[PDB]
Amino acid sequence: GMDYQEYQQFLARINTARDACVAKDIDVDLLMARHDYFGRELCKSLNIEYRNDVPFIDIILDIRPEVDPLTIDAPHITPDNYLYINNVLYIIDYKVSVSNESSVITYDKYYELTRDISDRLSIPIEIVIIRIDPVSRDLHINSDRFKELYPTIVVDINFNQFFDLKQLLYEKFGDDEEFLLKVA
Ligand SMILES: O=C1c2c(O)c(=O)ccn2N([C@H]2c3ccccc3SCc3c2ccc(F)c3F)[C@@H]2COCCN12
Ligand SMILES: [Mn+2]
Ligand SMILES: [Mn+2]
Ligand SMILES: [Mn+2]
Protein backbone atom coordinates (compact mmCIF):
# COMPACT_ATOMS: atom_id res chain seq x y z
CA GLY A 1 0.00 0.00 0.00
CA MET A 2 1.04 3.66 0.58
CA ASP A 3 4.07 4.51 2.84
CA TYR A 4 3.57 4.27 6.68
CA GLN A 5 5.10 7.82 7.13
CA GLU A 6 2.65 9.13 4.43
CA TYR A 7 -0.38 7.35 6.06
CA GLN A 8 0.36 8.79 9.57
CA GLN A 9 0.73 12.36 8.10
CA PHE A 10 -2.83 12.08 6.60
CA LEU A 11 -4.08 10.65 9.97
CA ALA A 12 -2.44 13.58 11.90
CA ARG A 13 -3.88 16.16 9.41
CA ILE A 14 -7.42 14.60 9.80
CA ASN A 15 -7.18 14.58 13.66
CA THR A 16 -6.00 18.29 13.81
CA ALA A 17 -8.39 19.70 11.08
CA ARG A 18 -11.39 21.70 12.50
CA ASP A 19 -12.20 23.63 9.24
CA ALA A 20 -14.04 22.46 6.04
CA CYS A 21 -11.47 24.08 3.62
CA VAL A 22 -8.52 22.27 5.40
CA ALA A 23 -10.65 19.04 5.22
CA LYS A 24 -11.21 19.52 1.42
CA ASP A 25 -7.40 20.06 0.95
CA ILE A 26 -6.84 16.64 2.69
CA ASP A 27 -9.50 15.16 0.27
CA VAL A 28 -7.74 16.58 -2.86
CA ASP A 29 -4.32 15.47 -1.42
CA LEU A 30 -5.69 11.87 -0.90
CA LEU A 31 -6.61 11.86 -4.66
CA MET A 32 -3.10 13.22 -5.60
CA ALA A 33 -1.31 10.64 -3.32
CA ARG A 34 -3.61 7.82 -4.68
CA HIS A 35 -2.72 8.90 -8.30
CA ASP A 36 1.05 9.15 -7.46
CA TYR A 37 0.88 5.73 -5.65
CA PHE A 38 -0.65 4.19 -8.84
CA GLY A 39 2.04 5.91 -11.01
CA ARG A 40 4.92 4.40 -8.95
CA GLU A 41 3.43 0.82 -9.02
CA LEU A 42 2.54 1.16 -12.78
CA CYS A 43 6.11 2.43 -13.62
CA LYS A 44 7.54 -0.66 -11.78
CA SER A 45 5.32 -2.94 -14.00
CA LEU A 46 6.34 -1.03 -17.23
CA ASN A 47 10.09 -0.93 -16.20
CA ILE A 48 10.30 2.89 -16.74
CA GLU A 49 11.83 5.48 -14.34
CA TYR A 50 9.02 6.96 -12.16
CA ARG A 51 8.27 10.56 -13.31
CA ASN A 52 5.45 13.11 -12.74
CA ASP A 53 4.44 16.30 -14.71
CA VAL A 54 7.68 16.34 -16.84
CA PRO A 55 7.97 19.39 -19.18
CA PHE A 56 7.53 18.26 -22.85
CA ILE A 57 10.71 20.24 -23.86
CA ASP A 58 12.77 18.07 -21.38
CA ILE A 59 11.29 14.95 -23.18
CA ILE A 60 12.35 16.38 -26.63
CA LEU A 61 15.87 17.15 -25.23
CA ASP A 62 16.11 13.54 -23.82
CA ILE A 63 14.98 11.67 -27.03
CA ARG A 64 16.69 14.18 -29.43
CA PRO A 65 19.58 15.84 -27.53
CA GLU A 66 20.93 17.94 -30.51
CA VAL A 67 17.66 20.05 -30.58
CA ASP A 68 18.17 23.75 -29.57
CA PRO A 69 16.13 24.21 -26.34
CA LEU A 70 16.12 28.03 -27.02
CA THR A 71 14.30 27.82 -30.45
CA ILE A 72 12.17 24.55 -30.54
CA ASP A 73 8.35 24.99 -31.03
CA ALA A 74 7.22 22.45 -28.33
CA PRO A 75 3.77 22.29 -26.63
CA HIS A 76 3.38 23.60 -23.00
CA ILE A 77 2.07 20.25 -21.54
CA THR A 78 3.47 18.27 -18.53
CA PRO A 79 2.58 14.55 -18.97
CA ASP A 80 3.10 12.15 -16.00
CA ASN A 81 5.66 10.07 -17.99
CA TYR A 82 6.86 8.93 -21.48
CA LEU A 83 8.57 5.98 -23.24
CA TYR A 84 10.78 6.51 -26.35
CA ILE A 85 11.30 3.08 -28.06
CA ASN A 86 12.02 2.14 -31.75
CA ASN A 87 11.70 5.86 -32.75
CA VAL A 88 8.12 6.09 -31.28
CA LEU A 89 7.35 8.58 -28.44
CA TYR A 90 4.57 7.23 -26.12
CA ILE A 91 3.17 10.09 -23.94
CA ILE A 92 1.85 8.42 -20.73
CA ASP A 93 -0.63 9.92 -18.23
CA TYR A 94 -1.76 8.08 -15.04
CA LYS A 95 -5.53 8.10 -14.19
CA VAL A 96 -7.42 6.77 -11.11
CA SER A 97 -11.16 7.09 -11.99
CA VAL A 98 -14.40 5.00 -12.26
CA SER A 99 -15.15 7.08 -15.45
CA ASN A 100 -13.26 7.69 -18.78
CA GLU A 101 -14.41 11.40 -18.70
CA SER A 102 -11.01 12.77 -17.42
CA SER A 103 -9.12 10.37 -19.84
CA VAL A 104 -10.96 11.80 -22.95
CA ILE A 105 -10.16 15.43 -21.81
CA THR A 106 -6.38 14.67 -21.36
CA TYR A 107 -6.23 12.52 -24.57
CA ASP A 108 -8.01 15.12 -26.80
CA LYS A 109 -5.70 17.91 -25.42
CA TYR A 110 -2.35 15.94 -25.55
CA TYR A 111 -3.20 14.49 -29.04
CA GLU A 112 -4.15 17.92 -30.54
CA LEU A 113 -1.05 19.72 -29.05
CA THR A 114 1.50 17.00 -30.19
CA ARG A 115 0.50 16.80 -33.94
CA ASP A 116 2.86 19.69 -34.96
CA ILE A 117 6.01 18.61 -32.97
CA SER A 118 5.37 15.03 -34.29
CA ASP A 119 5.50 16.34 -37.93
CA ARG A 120 8.54 18.62 -37.08
CA LEU A 121 10.55 15.76 -35.42
CA SER A 122 9.28 13.09 -37.93
CA ILE A 123 8.58 10.99 -34.74
CA PRO A 124 5.07 9.47 -34.37
CA ILE A 125 3.66 10.54 -30.93
CA GLU A 126 1.15 8.07 -29.32
CA ILE A 127 -1.00 9.42 -26.41
CA VAL A 128 -1.31 6.59 -23.79
CA ILE A 129 -3.83 7.20 -20.94
CA ILE A 130 -3.35 4.38 -18.35
CA ARG A 131 -6.47 4.32 -16.07
CA ILE A 132 -7.09 2.08 -13.03
CA ASP A 133 -10.74 1.94 -11.83
CA PRO A 134 -10.23 2.26 -8.02
CA VAL A 135 -13.32 0.02 -7.30
CA SER A 136 -12.96 -2.82 -9.92
CA ARG A 137 -9.09 -2.43 -9.80
CA ASP A 138 -9.26 -3.10 -13.62
CA LEU A 139 -6.53 -1.54 -15.86
CA HIS A 140 -7.89 0.26 -19.01
CA ILE A 141 -5.34 1.50 -21.64
CA ASN A 142 -6.62 3.30 -24.80
CA SER A 143 -3.48 2.63 -26.96
CA ASP A 144 -3.51 -0.68 -28.94
CA ARG A 145 0.04 0.26 -30.14
CA PHE A 146 1.26 0.55 -26.46
CA LYS A 147 -0.42 -2.78 -25.44
CA GLU A 148 1.27 -4.59 -28.45
CA LEU A 149 4.64 -3.16 -27.17
CA TYR A 150 4.27 -4.86 -23.73
CA PRO A 151 3.20 -8.24 -22.34
CA THR A 152 -0.24 -8.02 -20.56
CA ILE A 153 0.28 -5.09 -18.08
CA VAL A 154 -0.59 -6.08 -14.43
CA VAL A 155 -0.69 -3.50 -11.56
CA ASP A 156 -1.91 -5.66 -8.61
CA ILE A 157 -2.67 -2.92 -5.97
CA ASN A 158 -5.75 -1.59 -4.05
CA PHE A 159 -6.74 1.82 -2.53
CA ASN A 160 -8.30 0.48 0.76
CA GLN A 161 -5.95 2.75 2.82
CA PHE A 162 -7.11 5.82 0.75
CA PHE A 163 -10.78 4.68 1.18
CA ASP A 164 -10.11 4.33 4.98
CA LEU A 165 -8.52 7.83 5.33
CA LYS A 166 -11.43 9.31 3.27
CA GLN A 167 -13.90 7.43 5.58
CA LEU A 168 -12.23 8.98 8.73
CA LEU A 169 -12.39 12.44 7.01
CA TYR A 170 -16.21 11.98 6.48
CA GLU A 171 -16.67 10.63 10.08
CA LYS A 172 -15.38 14.08 11.21
CA PHE A 173 -16.71 16.45 8.44
CA GLY A 174 -19.71 14.45 7.02
CA ASP A 175 -22.26 16.85 8.69
CA ASP A 176 -20.33 20.07 7.73
CA GLU A 177 -22.39 21.61 4.84
CA GLU A 178 -19.35 23.78 3.85
CA PHE A 179 -17.21 20.57 3.45
CA LEU A 180 -19.87 18.54 1.49
CA LEU A 181 -20.15 21.38 -1.15
CA LYS A 182 -16.42 22.40 -0.97
CA VAL A 183 -14.51 22.40 -4.35
CA ALA A 184 -11.16 24.12 -3.37
O1 LIG B 1 -0.71 16.28 -13.34
C1 LIG B 1 -1.86 16.69 -13.25
C2 LIG B 1 -2.97 15.79 -13.17
C3 LIG B 1 -2.97 14.51 -13.78
O2 LIG B 1 -1.90 14.06 -14.45
C4 LIG B 1 -4.14 13.68 -13.67
O3 LIG B 1 -4.15 12.54 -14.21
C5 LIG B 1 -5.28 14.14 -12.96
C6 LIG B 1 -5.26 15.41 -12.39
N1 LIG B 1 -4.11 16.23 -12.50
N2 LIG B 1 -4.02 17.51 -11.88
C7 LIG B 1 -4.65 17.67 -10.56
C8 LIG B 1 -4.69 16.38 -9.75
C9 LIG B 1 -3.77 15.34 -9.91
C10 LIG B 1 -3.89 14.17 -9.19
C11 LIG B 1 -4.92 14.01 -8.30
C12 LIG B 1 -5.84 15.02 -8.12
C13 LIG B 1 -5.74 16.21 -8.84
S1 LIG B 1 -6.97 17.46 -8.56
C14 LIG B 1 -6.61 19.18 -9.11
C15 LIG B 1 -5.15 19.56 -9.00
C16 LIG B 1 -4.18 18.83 -9.70
C17 LIG B 1 -2.83 19.19 -9.57
C18 LIG B 1 -2.46 20.27 -8.79
C19 LIG B 1 -3.42 20.98 -8.12
F1 LIG B 1 -3.09 22.04 -7.34
C20 LIG B 1 -4.75 20.64 -8.22
F2 LIG B 1 -5.66 21.36 -7.55
C21 LIG B 1 -3.30 18.61 -12.56
C22 LIG B 1 -4.19 19.38 -13.53
O4 LIG B 1 -3.50 19.71 -14.74
C23 LIG B 1 -2.16 20.13 -14.47
C24 LIG B 1 -1.31 18.97 -14.00
N3 LIG B 1 -2.14 18.01 -13.25
MN1 LIG C 1 0.08 14.76 -13.99
MN1 LIG D 1 -2.15 11.83 -14.36
MN1 LIG E 1 3.41 -5.97 -16.22
Numbering used by the authors: 0 to 183
Sentences from the study reporting this entry:
In La Crosse virus, an orthobunyavirus, it has previously been shown that the cap-snatching endonuclease resides in the N-terminal domain of the L protein. The L protein serves as the primary effector, showcasing its multifunctional nature by encompassing both endonuclease (EndoN) activity in its N-terminus and RNA-dependent RNA polymerase (RdRp) activity. During cap-snatching short capped primers derived by endonucleolytic cleavage of host mRNAs by the EndoN are used by the RdRp to initiate the synthesis of vmRNA. The determined atomic structures of different EndoNs show that they harbour a conserved PD…D/ExK catalytic motif in the active site and bind divalent metal ions (Mn2+ or Mg2+) that are critical for catalytic activity.
Crystals of the LACV EndoN–baloxavir complex were obtained following the same procedure as for the L-742,001 complex in the presence of 5 mM MnCl2. The crystal diffracted to 2.2 Å resolution and was processed at 2.64 Å resolution in space group P6122 with four copies of LACV EndoN in the asymmetric unit. The baloxavir structure can be decomposed into two linked tricyclic scaffolds, a metal-chelating scaffold comprising an hydroxypyridotriazinedione motif and a specificity scaffold comprising a dibenzothiepine moiety. One conformation allows the side chain of Asp52 to coordinate the manganese ion Mn2, and the other is in an open form that moves it away from the active site. The chelation of baloxavir, as observed for the chelating DKA motif of L-742,001, occurred via the three coplanar O atoms of the hydroxypyrido­triazinedione motif that bind Mn1 and Mn2; each metal ion displays octahedral coordination with proteic catalytic residues and hydration shell [Fig. 4(c)]. The chelation and specificity motifs of the ligand adopt the same conformations in the active sites of the three molecules. The dibenzothiepine moiety adopts a V shape and makes contact along the Met31 side chain, as for Ile38 in H1N1 FLUAV PA-Nter [Fig. 4(d)]. The chelation and specificity motifs are positioned similarly in the two proteins, despite the absence of the N-terminal end of helix α2 carrying Tyr24 in the LACV EndoN active site, which is responsible for the locking of baloxavir into the H1N1 FLUAV PA-Nter active site. Three molecules of baloxavir were placed (chains A, C and D). The F o − F c density of chain B has a lower quality, making it impossible to locate baloxavir correctly. This is explained by the double conformation of the Tyr49–Phe55 loop containing the catalytic Asp52 residue and the high B factor of Mn2. The R 1 position facing His34 should be substituted by small alkyl groups to reinforce π-stacking interactions, the R 2 position offers the possibility to introduce larger groups and aromatic rings to target inter­actions with Leu30 and Arg33, and in position R 3 there is still more space to extend for buried interactions with Leu30 and Val27.
